[PDB]
UniProtKB/Swiss-Prot annotation, chain C:
Organism per entry: Severe acute respiratory syndrome coronavirus 2
Full protein segment contained here: 391 to 438 of 1273
Annotated function: Attaches the virion to the cell membrane by interacting with host receptor, initiating the infection. The major receptor is host ACE2. When S2/S2' has been cleaved, binding to the receptor triggers direct fusion at the cell membrane. When S2/S2' has not been cleaved, binding to the receptor results in internalization of the virus by endocytosis using host TFRC and GRM2 and leading to fusion of the virion membrane with the host endosomal membrane. Alternatively, may use NRP1/NRP2 and integrin as entry receptors.
Region Integrin-binding motif, residue ranges: 13-15
Protein name: Spike protein S1
Quaternary data: Binds to host ACE2. RBD also interacts with the N-linked glycan on 'Asn-90' of ACE2. Cleavage of S generates a polybasic C-terminal sequence on S1 that binds to host Neuropilin-1 (NRP1) and Neuropilin-2 (NRP2) receptors. Interacts with host integrin alpha-5/beta-1 (ITGA5:ITGB1) and with ACE2 in complex with integrin alpha-5/beta-1 (ITGA5:ITGB1). May interact via cytoplasmic c-terminus with M protein. May interact (via N-terminus) with host bilirubin and biliverdin, thereby preventing antibody binding to the SARS-CoV-2 spike NTD via an allosteric mechanism.
C-alpha cells in the first residue's frame, strides 16, 4: 500500500516525517515475506 | 517578449511542457524587479 | 516532570508558523531556527 515498491523513489519523492510512514509499510511487508519463507523452510526441513 | 499583455478580466494562459524552463537566460534579457516565489526558493529552480 | 527545559523565543510573520514544525521547508526553518526532526516539546504562537 505504499506509493512505490522502489525505496529510493520513496526517499527521493518524500522526506523524513512523511517518508518514514511510507517506508515502514515496506519494512512490515518485506519482513512478513522473509518470516513466511523461513517458516516454510523450517517445515520442509522437518520433512527432509 | 509579447507586444502587449492581456486585459486582466480575461487574462492569458499558456501551457509550458516538453521543454527546459532555463530561467536566467530569459529573465536577464528583459529588465524586471520582483521575483516573489512561494513554496520553492529562487536558486533551487536550477535543478528541481 | 522535565529533566531540562529550554524556552526559545523570537518573532516571525504569521505566514511562517507552519514551518516551525519538525522537518518542514521555508527560510526561517532553513536558515534561522531549525529544530530537530524528532524534537520533544511544544510550539506556541500569538499575534502582537
Amino acid at each position: 500500500g505504499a506509493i512505490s515498491s522502489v525505496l529510493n523513489d520513496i526517499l527521493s519523492r518524500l522526506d523524513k516525517v512523511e517518508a518514514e510512514v511510507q517506508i515502514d509499510r515496506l519494512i512490515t511487508g518485506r519482513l512478513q515475506s522473509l518470516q513466511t519463507y523461513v517458516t516454510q523452510q523450517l517445515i520442509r526441513a522437518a520433512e527432509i | 517578449n509579447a507586444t502587449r499583455f492581456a486585459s486582466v478580466y480575461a487574462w492569458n494562459r499558456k501551457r509550458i511542457s516538453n521543454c527546459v524552463a532555463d530561467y536566467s537566460v530569459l529573465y536577464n534579457f528583459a529588465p524586471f524587479f520582483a521575483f516573489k516565489c512561494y513554496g520553492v526558493s529562487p536558486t533551487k529552480l536550477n535543478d528541481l | 516532570c522535565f529533566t531540562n527545559v529550554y524556552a526559545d523565543s523570537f518573532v516571525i510573520r504569521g505566514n511562517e508558523v507552519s514551518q516551525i514544525a519538525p522537518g518542514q521547508t521555508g527560510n526561517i526553518a532553513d536558515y534561522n531556527y531549525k529544530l530537530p526532526d524528532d524534537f520533544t516539546g511544544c510550539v506556541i504562537a500569538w499575534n502582537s
